[PDB]
Amino acid sequence: DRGVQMLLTTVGAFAAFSLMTIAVGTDYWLYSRGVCKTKEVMTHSGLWRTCCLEGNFKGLCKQIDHFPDTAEYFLRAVRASSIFPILSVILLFMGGLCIAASEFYKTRHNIILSAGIFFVSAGLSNIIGIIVYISANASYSYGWSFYFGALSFIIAEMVGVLAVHMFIDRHKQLRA
C-alpha cells in the first residue's frame, strides 16, 4: 500500500539517522590496547575520545592525538575530522526533511526522488568513512558503535530504494 510504503520509509529514515548519530557520538568503536592518559591498558577508542578501561584509573578519556608524507598527511586530516561520517549524518537529515515535505506541499513528485538521492548518497559517504577510519588505524576488535554505523548504511540504502520505487509509482499513476 502507499500508506504502508510511506510509513515504512519514514520509520526507516528516522532509525538510520538515529543510529548514525549515536555512532558518530559514542566511543565504543575500536577496543584496543593503549595509554589512557599520558604526560598500555585496554581502551574504548571511539571517533573523538579514547576512554580507558580495566586500568589502574578507568573512565579517563583524552582526545585522540591526531597528528602525533603529504599522501599520509591528507589521510590523517580526513580522519582527524570525520567529514565523511559527519557528512553522512547531514545527508540523512536532509533526506528526512524531504520525506517529511512529501506529505505537505505534495504533488511536486520531485521531492521524493530528492529523498532517495540523499539516502543513497548518505550511504556512500558512510562507506567511505568506514574505509578511511579502518585505514587510519594502521588485537583490535571493533565495538557496537562501529556496527551501529554499518547498520545505518544498510537501512539507509533500503530506505533509498523504497523512495525511488515510490517515486516511480507516482509517475506511473500520473501517466494514467
Q: Which residues lie across from 61 on neighbouring strands?
A: 51
User: Does 117 engage in binding with other proteins (CB under 8 A)?
Assistant: yes
User: What's the closest the beta carbon of residue 63 comes to other proteins, in angstroms?
Assistant: 25
> Across-strand partners of 122?
none
Phi, psi of 61 (to 5 degrees): -135, 140
Residue 176 as a binder of other proteins (CB under 8 A): the answer is no
Between 4 and 176, name the residue whose CB sits nearer to other proteins. Answer: 176
In contact, 34 and 144? CB cutoff 8 Å: no
Residue 41, interface with other proteins (CB under 8 A)? no
Q: Binding marks (x or -) toward other proteins, 134..173, rule CB under 8 A? A: x---------------x--xx--x--xx--x--xx--xx-
**Would you count residue 124 as binding other proteins (CB under 8 A)?**
yes
Q: Are 111 and 163 in contact (CB under 8 A)?
A: no
Distance CA(55)–CA(62), nearest Å, equals 14
Least Cβ distance, residue 65 to other proteins (angstroms):
23
Q: Is 34 helix (H, G, I), strand (E, B) or coil?
A: strand
The correct pick among 40, 65, 175, 176 for binding other proteins (CB under 8 A) is 175
The distance from CA 159 to its chain's CA centroid, rounded to whole angstroms, is 14
Nearer to other proteins, 36 or 163 (CB): 163
Tell me how far, at minimum, the Cβ of 154 lies from other proteins, in Å.
Answer: 7
Which parts of the chain are beta strand (E)? 30-31, 33-34, 41-42, 49-51, 61-63, 141-142
Q: Using CB under 8 A as the criterion, which residues of the chain lie in contact with other proteins when the complex forms?
A: 113, 116-117, 120, 123-124, 127, 130-131, 134, 150, 153-154, 157, 160-161, 164, 167-168, 171-172, 175
